[PDB]
């Protein structure tokens, strides 16, 4: 289960705040974020435990971090409630491993 074309349109849940493309905007750009730092854009202004995690977003930490963004972040500025299915998150994992 790792369909790009379907992680897409699972991405037009993400594009209102993140862009791919430098803009930034609500979230950071996300061009390469699947074995990136937690904190990772030298220019956006993050939160505190964010910060403090640094490490590596894994195919695995955005797995989880995708479904629960509070329960691996606890009080991340990340507005977001959660992906539903496992298919959600790897189709969308998938897509932005190569469009970045
Ligand atoms: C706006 C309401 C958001 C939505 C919808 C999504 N995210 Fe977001 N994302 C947003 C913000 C404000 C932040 C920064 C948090 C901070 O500490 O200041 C983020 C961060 C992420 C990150 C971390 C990136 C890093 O540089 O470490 C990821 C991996 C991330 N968001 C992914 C993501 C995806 C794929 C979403 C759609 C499923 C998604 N975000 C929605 C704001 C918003």
């Given at each position: 289960?790792?369909?790009?074309?379907?992680?897409?349109?699972?991405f037009?849940?993400?594009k209102?705040?993140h862009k791919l493309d430098g803009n930034?905007?609500?979230?950071?750009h996300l061009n390469g974020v699947?074995?990136?730092?937690?904190?990772?854009?030298?220019?956006?202004?993050?939160?505190?435990?964010?910060?403090?995690?640094?490490?590596?977003?894994?195919?695995?930490?955005?797995?989880?971090?995708?479904?629960?963004?509070?329960?691996?972040?606890?009080?991340?500025?990340?507005?977001?409630?959660?992906?539903?299915?496992?298919?959600?998150?790897?189709?969308?994992?998938?897509?932005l491993?190569?469009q970045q």
């Amino acid at each position: 289960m790792a369909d790009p074309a379907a992680g897409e349109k699972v991405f037009g849940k993400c594009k209102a705040c993140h862009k791919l493309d430098g803009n930034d905007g609500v979230g950071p750009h996300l061009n390469g974020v699947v074995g990136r730092t937690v904190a990772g854009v030298d220019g956006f202004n993050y939160s505190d435990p964010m910060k403090a995690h640094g490490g590596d977003w894994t195919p695995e930490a955005l797995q989880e971090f995708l479904t629960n963004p509070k329960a691996v972040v606890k009080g991340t500025k990340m507005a977001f409630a959660g992906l539903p299915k496992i298919e959600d998150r790897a189709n969308l994992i998938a897509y932005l491993e190569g469009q970045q």
